[PDB]
Enzyme design. Structure first.
Site, PDB file in Angstrom:
ATOM      1  N   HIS A  41      69.434  19.118  41.345  1.00 54.52           N
ATOM      2  CA  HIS A  41      69.187  19.622  42.703  1.00 54.52           C
ATOM      3  C   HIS A  41      68.326  18.609  43.471  1.00 54.52           C
ATOM      4  O   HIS A  41      68.385  18.596  44.661  1.00 54.52           O
ATOM      5  CB  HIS A  41      68.508  21.025  42.687  1.00 54.52           C
ATOM      6  CG  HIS A  41      67.733  21.429  43.925  1.00 54.52           C
ATOM      7  ND1 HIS A  41      68.285  22.123  44.998  1.00 54.52           N
ATOM      8  CD2 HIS A  41      66.453  21.229  44.281  1.00 54.52           C
ATOM      9  CE1 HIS A  41      67.385  22.316  45.959  1.00 54.52           C
ATOM     10  NE2 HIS A  41      66.260  21.737  45.564  1.00 54.52           N
ATOM     11  N   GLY A 143      58.610  24.458  45.011  1.00 55.72           N
ATOM     12  CA  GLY A 143      58.074  23.230  44.415  1.00 55.72           C
ATOM     13  C   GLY A 143      58.051  23.241  42.890  1.00 55.72           C
ATOM     14  O   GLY A 143      57.631  22.284  42.243  1.00 55.72           O
ATOM     15  N   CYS A 145      60.469  23.819  40.735  1.00 59.93           N
ATOM     16  CA  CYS A 145      61.671  23.273  40.120  1.00 59.93           C
ATOM     17  C   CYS A 145      61.290  22.148  39.166  1.00 59.93           C
ATOM     18  O   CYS A 145      60.436  21.342  39.487  1.00 59.93           O
ATOM     19  CB  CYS A 145      62.625  22.647  41.126  1.00 59.93           C
ATOM     20  SG  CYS A 145      63.482  23.781  42.260  1.00 59.93           S
TER      21      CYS A 145
HETATM   22  C1  LIG Z   1      65.166  22.998  41.825  1.00 59.44           C
HETATM   23  O1  LIG Z   1      65.540  22.438  40.571  1.00 59.44           O
HETATM   24  C2  LIG Z   1      66.458  23.663  42.220  1.00 59.44           C
HETATM   25  C3  LIG Z   1      67.757  23.570  41.736  1.00 59.44           C
HETATM   26  S1  LIG Z   1      68.770  24.838  42.479  1.00 59.44           S
HETATM   27  C4  LIG Z   1      67.513  25.165  43.703  1.00 59.44           C
HETATM   28  N1  LIG Z   1      67.613  25.867  44.955  1.00 59.44           N
HETATM   29  C5  LIG Z   1      66.445  26.071  45.844  1.00 59.44           C
HETATM   30  C6  LIG Z   1      68.831  26.493  45.378  1.00 59.44           C
HETATM   31  C7  LIG Z   1      69.349  26.258  46.674  1.00 59.44           C
HETATM   32  C8  LIG Z   1      70.525  26.891  47.062  1.00 59.44           C
HETATM   33  C9  LIG Z   1      71.205  27.737  46.183  1.00 59.44           C
HETATM   34  C10 LIG Z   1      70.707  27.994  44.909  1.00 59.44           C
HETATM   35  C11 LIG Z   1      69.535  27.381  44.495  1.00 59.44           C
HETATM   36  N2  LIG Z   1      66.336  24.617  43.224  1.00 59.44           N
END
Ligand SMILES: *[C@@H](O)c1csc(N(C)c2ccccc2)n1
Ligand SMILES: *[C@@H](O)c1csc(N(C)c2ccccc2)n1
Lengths: 302, 302
Positions: A41, A143, A145
């Protein structure tokens, strides 16, 4: 005596946490030998999330697109590759603080400690379980993640979870350290939601055994039951089936307290049918299912 | 989102833990600069505990009576002295892993993390509170003496608790790092028991604010109340008085949720009068009082 949600000491893990930036996205990574591991991501924007092709997004990047910060010291990226939902950024320096470690995948019902992290800096440590529906009930903010989950045995860190996201109900989903999600969840924007959850019966039993070891016994009874008649009632209360294997795994706790596993089941059945009638067990008014039999032995025995 | 009993990362503390032996007693100590701190109980035997004179027991000892082990490396003791209920063993080597630190004493109602330790090796990390009766509800086994409690702010470890013993109800008593007990407890054999305990009202309020921040709101109501009428009811339920200061300390949480402190009190009163009617708040069926207003801000805000 006493019974707490106890995490592993987090030190060996804190020495591996780093900050990873790409574009305007910052998050955490895990620095072991000369690789840093982080959610893929990190190469997305907000508007990329609606249906990213990560193979695409990645080929348009270079090593110089990724800034790695360990404490102060800048780490130089000398290689990048994707592995399922994680990236691996090869760097020019091996982490001197690398513990002995392994990447394991856990099962639903097993526990692990989480070192929540923001910008490469560890902020706190807690224990949680993989739920039957492959979510965890974490405590994570924007943050976080790349924060990792782990278990420690001797000096060996079994990394089992990397954090990726929060679902609409406020629970959390992520991957193993090879980048494979726990449960049917994807790192793209979707109406995705936690599936139906159950109570981890074997764990509740283990916690009843903790309580007896800690002198709460009010819920005990002189009844017993069959496995089959137990599971008939557990099913009715959205509790997972108990198996012979679980009965066998509870054996040392049963021997240490001289309460038969099936006698403890008889106790649980009555607690499910009658409730607590306003008393508590190890400071709880609910039946707690986030401690494994291993957790109880390790904490009530050493 | 999510709300967990979250400890501080324990690393800075794990690097200070050592094993201290005298006679056939082993326990833990805390190694900062060139001093190791440990419970004075280390110079006793079982039969000494009935009424020891520690000034006596100590004068009959020498530096060579104390073996300090840091990991493997033997530390050489080059000086000893007693400070209230702790000993200070000067050693020939300063701890290279000494963090910035302070020795503070906390108040009843404040929280801290505990790194339980056995033989100098950290086994687990959990959060707890100093109860109004100056006990803690720890989780400690034989050998855990000298385990420390702490808070971390920036890179600075505020050590606030050293573990000494378990009382008959299964709760724990200890000292500050200058060797002064929390509460009326003594390191001698006595029928000593925890005094009457109360609920930390301000903390319950802080946790209600956490729950609203995390989308549980069922317990809210359109009522309000006076401070005075609130305390009339809290007294009736063995809850500590709430003060204007506590009302002021809850101000940011009240502003962040737009629920007035006194409105939240009105909610609590009804929960005390009616119970939960089988629902829960942040996964609890009880009112939780082991999170300070600071804990809630730090975890629901960063
Ligand atoms: C941080 O590793 C990460 C990977 S997926 C994600 N987000 C914020 C997200 C955005 C849109 C749809 C699902 C998940 N954060
Ligand atoms: C370990 O620091 C320590 C100090 S007091 C104590 N014990 C086991 C004890 C013995 C007899 C009476 C009260 C307390 N442990």
């Amino acid at each position: 005596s006493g019974f707490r949600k106890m995490a592993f000491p987090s030190g060996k893990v804190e020495g591996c946490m780093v900050q990873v930036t790409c574009g305007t996205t910052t998050l955490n990574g895990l620095w072991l030998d000369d690789v840093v591991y982080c959610p893929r991501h990190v190469i997305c924007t907000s508007e990329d999330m609606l249906n990213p092709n990560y193979e695409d997004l990645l080929i348009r990047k270079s090593n110089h697109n990724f800034l790695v910060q360990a404490g102060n010291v800048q780490l130089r990226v000398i290689g990048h590759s994707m592995q399922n939902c994680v990236l691996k950024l090869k760097v020019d320096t091996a982490n001197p603080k690398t513990p002995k470690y392994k990447f394991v995948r856990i099962q639903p019902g097993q526990t692990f400690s989480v070192l929540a992290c923001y910008n490469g800096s560890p902020s706190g440590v807690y224990q949680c379980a993989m739920r039957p529906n492959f979510t965890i009930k974490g405590s994570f903010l924007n943050g976080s993640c790349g924060s990792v989950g782990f278990n420690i045995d001797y000096d060996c860190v079994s990394f089992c979870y990397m954090h990726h996201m929060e679902l609409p109900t406020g629970v959390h989903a992520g991957t193993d350290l090879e980048g494979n999600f726990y449960g049917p969840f994807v790192d793209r924007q979707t109406a995705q939601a936690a599936g139906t959850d159950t109570t981890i019966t074997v764990n509740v039993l283990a916690w009843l055994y903790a309580a007896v070891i800690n002198g709460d016994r009010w819920f005990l009874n002189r009844f017993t039951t069959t496995l089959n008649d137990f599971n008939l009632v557990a099913m009715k209360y959205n509790y997972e089936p108990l198996t012979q294997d679980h009965v066998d795994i509870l054996g040392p706790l049963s021997a240490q307290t001289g309460i038969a596993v099936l006698d403890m089941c008889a106790s649980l059945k009555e607690l499910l049918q009658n409730g607590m009638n306003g008393r508590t067990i190890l400071g709880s008014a609910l039946l707690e299912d986030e401690f494994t039999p291993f957790d109880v032995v390790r904490q009530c025995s050493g």
